[PDB]
Amino acid sequence: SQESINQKLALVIKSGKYTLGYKSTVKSLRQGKSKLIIIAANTPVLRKSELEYYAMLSKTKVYYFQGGNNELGTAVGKLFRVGVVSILEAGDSDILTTLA
Amino acid sequence: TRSSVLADALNAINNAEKTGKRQVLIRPSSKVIIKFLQVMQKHGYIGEFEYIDDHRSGKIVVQLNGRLNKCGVISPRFNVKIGDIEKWTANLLPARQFGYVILTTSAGIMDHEEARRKHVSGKILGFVY
Amino acid sequence: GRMHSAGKGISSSAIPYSRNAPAWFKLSSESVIEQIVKYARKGLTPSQIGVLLRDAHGVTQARVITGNKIMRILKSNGLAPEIPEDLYYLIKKAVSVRKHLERNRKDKDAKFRLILIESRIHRLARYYRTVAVLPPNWKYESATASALVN
Amino acid sequence: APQAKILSQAPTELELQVAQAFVELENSSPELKAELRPLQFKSIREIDVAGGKKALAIFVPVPSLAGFHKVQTKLTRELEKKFQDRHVIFLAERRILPKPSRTSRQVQKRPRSRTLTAVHDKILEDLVFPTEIVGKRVRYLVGGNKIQKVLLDSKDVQQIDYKLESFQAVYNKLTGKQIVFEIPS
Amino acid sequence: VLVQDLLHPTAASEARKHKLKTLVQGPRSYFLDVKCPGCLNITTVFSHAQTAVTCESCSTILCTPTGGKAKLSEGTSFRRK
Ligand SMILES: [Zn+2]
């Protein structure tokens, strides 16, 4: 039924290339390197809107994590909270072509 | 959980012998079981027996002839000096003139008479008659 | 019987009396292993990998044809996880139940089953810490346990 | 000289005859030589059969057993044809290490491939080589004796239905233990 | 009973017994050689499948999993080997 997004990300985090945080996302997105961005639920709406605008300019995919930054940190295997993720190389994963 | 495969085997054998059956299936197998059955076979208490080789541990099928009264098991496997087999035999055998206690030694598994002849001792396993 | 219940069920796999076979397989241990590593790179466990190769790739089990076990192969190729799947999945289970408990304090059965799970974890951890595949302490702490399994 | 070359030891007349047979097979050549150049044997043991015939035991190093095992059919067919009055079979020289005693002692412990029972079982498995064994049973007879029944599969048993007694004698001569074969129906 | 050959039981009693409680345990399952009507590639398929197995091309369906025996898809060519 549902192959979890968390399980997908754990493959990207061990196989692929990611960056965390708004500043590094925006940097990579100015560079056009980013394919997907994942955005927490508790992120401020202005930040979310700003990212959406950068993404519709870069023709980049956007996933809305059904979860806040604390859970998203845990999902990507980190002891801190993270509000936005940028995927720049998926490795052995499938997230680009998946239902996302 | 099983603790003594030998105990399970000999309870099964005794129960079948009580019922008058002429064959038993025993699982799992072991070298010690084989040695026990070889002893009983040599002293005539059982017939042939066949070791099936599953790749797990084994089963055994024994062809029986009657004449058996009780096969039993001593758990714990006590430590036995050579002086005490007489006391044991008096305690857990019907008579002096028949029945055999089997024990495990560094010289090997054998009956208490053979252990007397070799002047050795070891550990007690069970009894047959 | 069952560890933490009265269950007496016995459903399991009946391996055949054979250490080869199929005759009909006829591919290679090596190409099979290539497939193995590929699906390992996909980040699957030996369990579902062997299930896959059963259902699809004509495979009985690599134990037969390779002369090795799956986890051995992954270790040899550097694909081994830090931990085993046993603890992995048990910890997922514990964590899920813990999250459920956070928002349902009153569910007693979840609480009960949780300590069952954690006792399983601790005993199994004693085993793996005995065989030294782990660091000697490692002390699963349910609080930090989330980002460990994740 | 691919004659004394291809064993890999000097003696003897039997193995040399065998090597020249190898050579005539290599001269076939095409689909034969291609896989027969790497395949060398070590020793031979000719022994009696209860009937009239004799029985050839061809010993092997066992990194070569694969190619030998790839064929088995044809090398045995041609050798049975040429060296007649015989039952040919291939075998692997497996080293048996003893179980260490308290006196006897050795490091590099003792893997289970090199133990005695495993070596004997595999020697048997190569004696049959086709027809994967599908059953072993061991009767312990009241005269303190033991005999092993080996239950074979019906597939490809036509090639070896006439070698059973010779195989029995072979296992008895090498291992010292009795043997019988069986086909389920 | 009280006398019988436990080594040579009947095939009927051994086929009706549980797989583990036979004299020698072993699988009652098997493998199938399968080609769908569309393509002509062969697929090796386990009888009791845990996955929705696909053939090499066309990405459609060969057999759908169930609790026990796999449910093969619509009419296809399937052997037992
Ligand atoms: Zn398809």
Q: Helix (H, G, I), strand (E, B), or coil: what is residue D58?
A: strand
Asked if the C-beta of C41 comes within 8 angstroms of chain A's C-beta atoms, the answer is yes
Q: Estimate the share of chain B in helix, then strand, then coil, as percent rounded to the nearest 5.
A: 35, 25, 40
Structure tokens at C23: 């005759």
Task: Tell me whether residues C57 and E44 touch, CB distance under 8 A.
Answer: yes
Task: Please name the helix (run of DSSP H) or strand (run of DSSP E) that holds residue E12, with its range, or none.
Answer: helix E11-16
How far apart are alpha carbons D147 and D172 in whole angstroms? 11
Residue type, A96: L
- Alpha-carbon torsion C46, C48, C54, C58, what sign? negative
- Alpha-carbon torsion B96, B98, B99, B102, what sign? positive
Structure tokens at A36: 């997907």
Q: How far is the CA of E38 from the centre of ligand 1 (A)?
A: 8
Distances (CA, A) of E6 to B40, B45, E3, E14: 21, 20, 9, 11
Name the residue among D44, D39, D57 with its Cα closest to residue D16: D44
Name the residue among E52, D57, B70 with its Cα closest to residue A1: E52
Q: How far is the CA of E33 from the centre of ligand 1 (A)?
A: 14
Residue E53 DSSP symbol: B
Residue D135 DSSP symbol: E
How far apart are alpha carbons C61 and C68 in whole angstroms? 10
Point out which residues pair with A36 in neighbouring strands. Answer: A61, A87
Confirm if D174 and D126 have CB atoms less than 8 A apart.
Answer: no
Out of C34, C64, C80, a domain closes at C80
How far apart are alpha carbons A48 and A64 in whole angstroms? 10
Residue type, B82: I
Distances (CA, A) of C51 to C83, C105, E62: 21, 38, 16
Residues C38, C53, single domain; the answer is yes
Q: How far is the CA of C56 from the centre of ligand 1 (A)?
A: 12
Distances (CA, A) of C29 to B105, C25, C47, C51: 47, 10, 18, 17
Confirm if C126 and C119 have CB atoms less than 8 A apart.
Answer: no
Distances (CA, A) of B88 to A16, B128, B129, C18, C82: 74, 13, 14, 47, 56
Point out which residues pair with D87 in neighbouring strands. Answer: D55
Residues C76, C86, single domain; the answer is no
Task: Tell me whether residues E53 and C10 touch, CB distance under 8 A.
Answer: no
How far apart are alpha carbons B126 and B104 in whole angstroms? 10
Name the residue among C50, C44, C85, C81 with its Cα closest to residue C68: C50
Residue C10: inside a domain = no
Residues C89, C73, single domain; the answer is no
Please, which chains are in contact with B (at least 3 CB pairs closer than 8 A)?
C, D, E
Residue of C nearest to D135 (CA): C17
Task: Please name the helix (run of DSSP H) or strand (run of DSSP E) that holds residue A50, with its range, or none.
Answer: helix A45-58
How far apart are alpha carbons B24 and B2 in whole angstroms? 19
Residues C48, C96, single domain; the answer is no
* A17: Cβ contacts below 8 Å, ≥ 6 apart: A87, A88, A89, A91
* D87: Cβ contacts below 8 Å, ≥ 6 apart: D49, D53, D54, D55, D56, D80, D162, D163, D166
What are the chain D neighbours of C28 within 8 Å (beta carbons)? none
Task: Tell me whether residues E25 and B54 touch, CB distance under 8 A.
Answer: yes
For C93, the domain range is 81-150
Confirm if C125 and C138 have CB atoms less than 8 A apart.
Answer: yes
Task: Tell me whether residues B48 and D139 touch, CB distance under 8 A.
Answer: yes
Looking up tokens 């072509």 gives: A97
Out of C80, C99, C116, a domain closes at C80
Residue C130: inside a domain = yes
Confirm if E42 and E33 have CB atoms less than 8 A apart.
Answer: yes
Query: How many structural domains are present in chain E?
Result: 1
Residues C58, C100, single domain; the answer is no
Q: Helix (H, G, I), strand (E, B), or coil: what is residue B80?
A: strand
Residue of D nearest to C21 (CA): D132
Residue of C nearest to B52 (CA): C17
Q: How does strand B100-105 pair with strand B59-63?
A: unpaired
How far apart are alpha carbons D131 and D159 in whole angstroms? 9
Task: Tell me whether residues B61 and E6 touch, CB distance under 8 A.
Answer: yes
Residue D97 DSSP symbol: P
How far apart are alpha carbons D45 and D63 in whole angstroms? 20
What was the elucidation method? cryo-EM
Q: Which residues of C83-101 are buried (b: 16+ CB within 10 A; e: fewer)?
A: bbeebbebbebbbebbeee
How far apart are alpha carbons A64 and B3 in whole angstroms? 57
Looking up tokens 């830090």 gives: C82
Report CA D171 to chain centroid distance, whole Å.
10
CA distance B53 to chain E (A): 9
Report CA E80 to chain centroid distance, whole Å.
8
Confirm if B71 and B43 have CB atoms less than 8 A apart.
Answer: no
Residue C4: inside a domain = no
Query: How many structural domains are present in chain C?
Result: 2
Residue type, A49: S
Locate the domains of chain D by residue range. 1-185
CA distance C101 to chain E (A): 31
Closest residue to E51, CB basis, from C17, C52, C58:
C52
Residue C118: inside a domain = yes
Residues C75, C86, single domain; the answer is no
Q: How does strand B49-52 pair with strand B59-63?
A: antiparallel
Q: How far is the CA of E57 from the centre of ligand 1 (A)?
A: 5
Out of C63, C80, C97, a domain closes at C80
What totals of helices (H) and strands (E) does chain D contain, helices first?
6, 6
Optimal mutation site among B55, B56, B59, interface C, most CBs of chain C within 10 A: B55
For E42, the domain range is 1-81
How far apart are alpha carbons C26 and D132 in whole angstroms? 16
How far apart are alpha carbons A17 and A90 in whole angstroms? 6
Residue type, A93: S
H runs (alpha helix) in chain C:
29-41, 46-55, 62-65, 70-77, 85-103, 108-130, 145-149
Confirm if B62 and D140 have CB atoms less than 8 A apart.
Answer: no
Q: How does strand A61-64 pair with strand A36-39?
A: parallel
Structure tokens at C133: 């595949």
* B52: Cβ contacts below 8 Å, ≥ 6 apart: B29, B58, B59, B60, B61, D136, D137, E7, E23, E24
